[PDB]
Design a protein around this nucleic acid. Structure first.
Ligand SMILES: [Mg+2]
Ligand SMILES: [Mg+2]
Ligand SMILES: [Mg+2]
Ligand SMILES: [Mg+2]
Ligand SMILES: [Mg+2]
Ligand SMILES: [Mg+2]
Ligand SMILES: [Mg+2]
Ligand SMILES: [Mg+2]
Ligand SMILES: [Mg+2]
Ligand SMILES: [Mg+2]
Ligand SMILES: [Mg+2]
Ligand SMILES: [Mg+2]
Ligand SMILES: [Zn+2]
Lengths: 36, 134, 129, 140, 98, 48
RNA sequence: GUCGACGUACUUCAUAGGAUCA
RNA sequence: UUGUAAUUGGAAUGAGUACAAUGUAAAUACCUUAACGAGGAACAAUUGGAGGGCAAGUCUGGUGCCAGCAGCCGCGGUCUCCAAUAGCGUAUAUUGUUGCAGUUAAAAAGCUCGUAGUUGAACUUUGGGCCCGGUU
RNA sequence: GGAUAGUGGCCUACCAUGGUUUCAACGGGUAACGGGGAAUAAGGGUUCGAUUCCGGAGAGGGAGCCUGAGAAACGGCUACCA
């Protein structure tokens, strides 16, 4: 009742901080380069 | 000669000729005469109020059909009757006969979508963040 | 009726260059035409030319060496300030240092580079490149 | 090694740009200088480069295109040698970009642009409207 | 009323944000330098665009022009001070190479 | 045999002649700043 | 009055061409 | 050697609370700072878009077992990815002087005369001989 | 000549018949306070400017005044209209 967030989708914790999300994306991209 | 004056003292003829000819544009004519909103769907407004007359697709068997999301609305400003979309049949439960609905631009022929009902956003109702006041 | 004799002269020169003629006849002559042709001569676009006197406006015979890409007149002769010269060079010339824009300034008829060096300006007569 | 997905991490200023035969025509038609127009578009020093195929292609054009031939021979425009028999410039230009990923391609032919587009990491410059435009160059 | 206080935008949206090569370049930049969002990259790009446009405009001026000399020397001094430009590259051409 | 169509001379009123077909000269009755009219007219319609 | 003319605002019909292959 | 953790170790810190001091006309706040303040760090980041999969379930059609629509509802019982990011979405709105075109697909008046307007042939001190002081 | 602080058809008496206009007068429209400025644009241009400064005008609508160096004042007065 307090926050009244209602019905919202499930969102990964990485969305809470953009820096962490981009860090993970870049490291994953590097692992993909090592295969290319 | 290109069919235009080129003399150094012919500024007046160039100005007057240009002014007479700008009226050929439809964009210019509408802009100056203030008739650019005749073509607008709401007659110059970005949103319109309406009265929900009936839910035409309430009875259609196939769920979430395009027909099921249409509602027949009467525009309050001029009384003309138009058709509007609802985001989904789940939202169609909130809309019922004889509520004021705020329409916005969008089965061909349906050019309007409902954004508010009874002064409350449908998306707010659909997300269970508000109650429709009656 | 004849409005700009310089336009006629420059057009005759351009047509003669196009057809590959080695020399062209210009009629009538004038001081402005002679000074324009002298500017072109100094810059090498045309060769020797000879003025024929017949107790009328006169005539000219110009030797052509095929080095002239285009010569033209800007009519009306717009008043050009020092700042406005660069605009005209950008508009009329295919490149920056390819050609010359000829001005009749208060110090005479001259190409635009001479005008900039002398710090003068005036009306614009035409271009050669 | 110079390409990061579709991003070329080797092309850096000053840029080396290959001049196509048709690029000069529209540069003249629009009264755009080759050296400065590229400077304005990219805000960097540009080294235009003319190969033997385009240069031979220009000479075959005829007297009408003398101005373009004069501009092509300006001393600032460096020359690139060719070690191949064919004189078709479009095939030559496609070849060089494949070998080494440092060149910008300045052209206006639709067909050649498509072939370069398929090659990854090749910035593709063109002249349209009033000045030059660069498509695939993130540093802009 | 009191006099206005000036404000300005330190970033701008790029002409075509959706270029795939551009997206990859921003990804690499953010990952390498640990940037929080694309706003920081846009900010640095806006600063660099301003600097290079100023340098180009000065270059358009004829050499020995007092305005060119004064402004170019000031700009090169600033760039050298912040460390972007090396000491040996004190010319406006290398400012365009940043 | 298909003869070539004769493009008829216009009898429909020209854009500069349509402006006088109504009671008055439509050109005379115009605002000084149509940009402000559009912005003000839109906001008023929302309030109405 | 499912009236005529005009003005205004819209809808719609006319897009495939060459080469190879089966 | 890649990915996933309501796994786990001890280090860091401000959102907030608050002696105090500073701040202020008096206050609030900022900058400082004792003492508190972190594992689901529940001290619970958002706004849009795309794509799935599941049933003894429901509807429609028919060259059998299928296809389309779609599926919070079934016998009992009370999910993944993409874009921006403290911001994001939705609706309306947003002529050529340089430099346009007029045979055959907008637009050359049936023709001529003619006022205003715009425009209007060439020519009048050119050349030559010296001196002075400046830049590169 | 009168009046004004003062020039002036500003008004009065007597005189002449003049003055503006296709280089657009006059009339009409203006969702017209003007400018410094704002946006866009490669350049020419196009649009916006009630709104931090300057100047003008108004204090519900017309009209007329006292006081005072200064007001046709309106957080001064008198009449009329609503
Ligand atoms: Mg002609
Ligand atoms: Mg006349
Ligand atoms: Mg004359
Ligand atoms: Mg009188
Ligand atoms: Mg205005
Ligand atoms: Mg007004
Ligand atoms: Mg104002
Ligand atoms: Mg007042
Ligand atoms: Mg009031
Ligand atoms: Mg008063
Ligand atoms: Mg009051
Ligand atoms: Mg007052
Ligand atoms: Zn080659």
């Amino acid at each position: 009742i307090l926050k009244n967030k209602g019905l919202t989708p499930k969102r990964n914790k990485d969305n809470r901080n953009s820096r962490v999300k981009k860090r993970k994306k870049y490291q994953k991209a590097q692992k993909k380069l090592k295969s290319v | 000669g290109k069919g235009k004056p080129r003399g150094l003292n012919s500024a007046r003829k160039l100005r007057v000729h240009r002014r007479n000819n700008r009226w050929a544009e439809n964009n210019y004519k509408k802009r100056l005469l203030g008739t650019a909103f005749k073509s607008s769907p709401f007659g110059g407004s970005s949103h319109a109020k309406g009265i929900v007359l009936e839910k035409l697709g309430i009875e259609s068997k196939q769920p979430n059909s395009a027909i099921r999301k249409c509602v027949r609305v009467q525009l309050i400003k001029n009384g003309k009757k138009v058709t509007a979309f609802v985001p989904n049949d789940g939202c169609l439960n909130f809309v019922d006969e004889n509520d004021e609905v705020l329409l916005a631009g969008f089965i061909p022929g349906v050019r309007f979508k409902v954004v508010k009902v009874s002064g409350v956003s449908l998306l707010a109702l659909w997300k269970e963040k508000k109650e429709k006041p009656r | 009726t004849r409005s700009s004799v310089l336009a006629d002269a420059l057009n005759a020169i351009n047509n003669a260059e196009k057809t590959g003629k080695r020399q062209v006849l210009i009629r009538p002559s004038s001081k402005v035409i002679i000074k324009f042709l002298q500017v072109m001569q100094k810059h090498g676009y045309i060769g020797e030319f000879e003025y024929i006197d017949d107790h009328r406006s006169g005539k000219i015979v110009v030797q052509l060496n095929g080095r002239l890409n285009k010569c033209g007149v800007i009519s009306p002769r717009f008043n050009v300030k020092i700042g406005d010269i660069e605009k005209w060079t950008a508009n009329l010339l295919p490149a920056r240092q390819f050609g010359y824009v000829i001005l009749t300034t208060s110090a005479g008829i001259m190409d635009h580079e001479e005008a900039r060096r002398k710090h003068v300006s005036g009306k614009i007569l035409g271009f050669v490149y | 090694s110079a390409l990061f997905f579709q991003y070329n991490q080797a092309i850096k200023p000053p840029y080396q740009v290959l001049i196509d035969t048709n690029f000069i025509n529209f540069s003249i038609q629009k009264k755009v200088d080759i050296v400065r127009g590229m400077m304005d578009c990219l805000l960097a020093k540009c080294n235009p480069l003319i190969t033997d195929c385009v240069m031979a292609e220009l000479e075959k054009l005829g007297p009408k295109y003398r101005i373009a031939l004069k501009l092509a021979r300006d001393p600032r425009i460096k020359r690139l040698s060719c070690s191949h028999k064919g004189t078709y410039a479009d095939d030559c230009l496609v070849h060089r970009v494949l070998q080494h990923k440092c060149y910008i391609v300045a052209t206006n032919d639709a067909g050649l642009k498509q072939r370069i587009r398929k090659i990854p990491g090749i910035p593709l410059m063109s002249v349209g409207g009033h000045a030059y435009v660069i498509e695939k160059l993130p540093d802009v | 009323p009191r006099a206005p206080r000036t404000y300005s935008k330190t970033y701008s949206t790029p002409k075509r944000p959706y270029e795939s090569s551009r997206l990859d370049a921003e990804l690499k930049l953010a990952g390498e330098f640990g940037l929080k969002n694309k706003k920081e990259i846009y900010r640095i790009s806006f600063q660099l665009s301003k600097i290079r446009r100023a340098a180009r405009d000065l270059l358009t001026r004829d050499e020995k022009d007092p305005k060119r000399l004064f402004e170019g020397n000031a700009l090169i001094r600033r760039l050298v001070r912040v460390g972007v430009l090396s000491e040996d590259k004190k010319k406006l051409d290398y400012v365009l190479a940043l | 045999q298909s003869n070539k169509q004769h493009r008829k001379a216009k009898e429909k009123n020209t854009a500069k002649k349509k402006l006088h077909t109504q009671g008055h000269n439509a050109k005379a009755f115009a605002v000084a700043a149509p940009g402000k009219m559009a912005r003000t007219m839109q906001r008023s319609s929302d309030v109405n």
